[PDB]
Each structure stands twice: as C-alpha cells, then as structure tokens.
C-alpha cells in the first residue's frame, strides 16, 4: 500500500516517472498566485458592517457596488501566470493532468493554457459573467466586465438592464454543479495529488484530500504544513507512508520538481516566452 520509495520530492518525482502514475490531480489555492501580485486575503473606504461582508453573498445582494469598487482597486495591472501555472500547463501538454481543482478566481489557469475540460473552478471565476435575471442569464466575457469595472459603471445587462455578476462563488453560495460531477469520477482514478498554495481551510474544497484512494500519494507544496487532523495529512508520524510536505514558495517547489523530472529548460523557456508575450500585448 506504499507507492513512494521515500517521502521526499525526489520520491514523488520517481513515482511520477513510474507506470503507476498515469493521472495527476492538482488542488491549488491563493499561494500559487501571490507571486503574480494577487492578494491572499484597508477596506475602510467601503463602510462595511464587518470586513468579511465584502466576500459574502448576503452583502453583495444588499449592496453590490462596494464589491465592484474593490475589484477595481485590487484589479491587477497585468494577468501574468506563475511558474506553478505553467508547470500545470506542462502536465497538461504531456498528458499527465487529469484535473486542476482551483480555489482561485483570477483566471490565471486559463491564461496559462489550461482549458475548461482541464479545470474545476470550485469557487467560480471572473472569466465569464452572467445577468442575474433567471429569464435572461445573458453571458458576458472578461473584457466586457473589465470595461464596466474600470469605467466605474455598475455592470448592467444589455438585454434587460439587470445586474451582471462575475461567475464567482461568494461565501455562503453553493459550489457549482461541475465540482460535484467531476469529483465522483476523478478521485477514484487519481494516482497522485499535488496540493499547492492552499492551507485547506475552506470547505468543501479541503475535504477533497480525503476522497483520494488511501494508497494515492499526496505532495503538499505550501508555505506551512496543512491538512493535519479522518483522512487527513500525515507527514511526520511513525505511520506516515504517503504524504510529503515541501515547505516554501510554490514557485520554488515547482521549479525543483520540474528539474527532478527533467523539465527545467522547457519550463524556463515556457515561462519566459509567455511572460514576455504578455508584456508585449499589455
């Protein structure tokens, strides 16, 4: 029931290069976007009942304007995916990626080249928006929403003038149905979990680590150990057998893993070319 030869990054690499590792699932959080300038959460200017209300569906339903104002204030001057995003892109290109489950709404996975079939955006995204009226549900792309946010015009539907909301899951909202559809099949077939940039404190996303088979190795690349209790993470006990913790910056851990897999030069060229191509079209 032990598939790793040693509980290190090198053991994970050698396992990835073995016949048993055919399907890899990535579970990613805010830590994989911090080096891109996107915050891992002032707000006094918005006059909120409590600072967290800005992220809850109740307050957005009451007053949607503070969210759009804050979206403009935190709107990144550039959408540049990180080394971690392009490592997942390499996993996709080589046929090893089964799915990327993400907690982020910043669309950086799609900009890195991951497609809809590769992604489960568990908390939604800014990539698309919809008119809130159920008899309309008109869809708008990211450029439309960005132009509405920066002109400081509250986004209204061009067909029925109702409010248009980014396709994100506020706190208190139900997760999208694709989450629960994909999790049923994906976590019976998964051979490896790559948990990157999340401290596993948001539910039901965190519980995903207990859906994998008990023999499936799980590598945590995070600034802190997390997921320790239940099918929780066990990095340090005498009964540890499958969980590996690499503590540090996510970009650094992905660089080390890619080098151990022989992908250092390719990942370098990919990241540099894409960052330059984004700086050009900026």
């Amino acid at each position: 029931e032990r598939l790793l030869d040693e509980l290190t990054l090198e053991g994970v690499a050698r396992y990835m290069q073995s016949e048993r590792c055919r399907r890899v699932i990535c579970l990613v959080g805010a830590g994989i976007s911090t080096s891109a300038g996107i915050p891992d959460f002032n707000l006094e200017k918005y006059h909120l009942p409590y600072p967290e209300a800005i992220f809850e569906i109740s307050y957005f339903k009451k007053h949607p304007e503070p969210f759009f104002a804050l979206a403009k204030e935190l709107y990144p001057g550039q959408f540049k995916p990180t080394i971690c995003h392009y490592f997942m892109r390499l996993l996709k290109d080589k046929g090893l990626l089964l799915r990327c489950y993400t907690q982020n709404i910043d669309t950086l996975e799609r900009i890195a080249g991951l497609e809809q079939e590769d992604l489960v955006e568990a908390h939604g995204t800014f990539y698309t928006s919809h008119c809130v009226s159920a008899s309309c549900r008109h869809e708008y792309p990211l450029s439309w929403m960005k132009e509405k946010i920066f002109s400081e015009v509250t986004p209204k539907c061009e067909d029925c003038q109702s409010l248009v909301k980014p396709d994100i899951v506020f706190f208190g909202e139900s997760l999208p149905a694709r989450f629960f559809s994909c999790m049923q099949s994906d976590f019976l077939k998964v051979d490896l979990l790559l948990v990157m940039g999340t401290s596993l404190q948001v539910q039901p996303f965190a519980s995903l680590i207990s859906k994998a088979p008990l023999s499936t190795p799980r590598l945590l690349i995070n600034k802190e150990k997390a997921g320790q209790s239940g099918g929780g993470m066990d990095f340090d006990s005498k009964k540890a057998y499958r969980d590996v913790a690499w503590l540090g910056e996510c970009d650094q851990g992905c660089l080390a893993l890619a080098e151990l897999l022989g992908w250092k030069k390719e990942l370098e060229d990919l990241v540099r070319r894409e960052h330059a191509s984004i700086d050009a079209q900026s």
Binding site: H123, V169, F171, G172, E173, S174, L175, F180, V202, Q203
Partner: peptide
C-alpha cells in the same frame, strides 16, 4: 436543501 456552500 441546497448543494454544499463555501464556508471558511
């Protein structure tokens, strides 16, 4: 009842 909700 509804699908499980995002909770911190």
């Amino acid at each position: 009842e509804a699908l499980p909700k995002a909770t911190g």
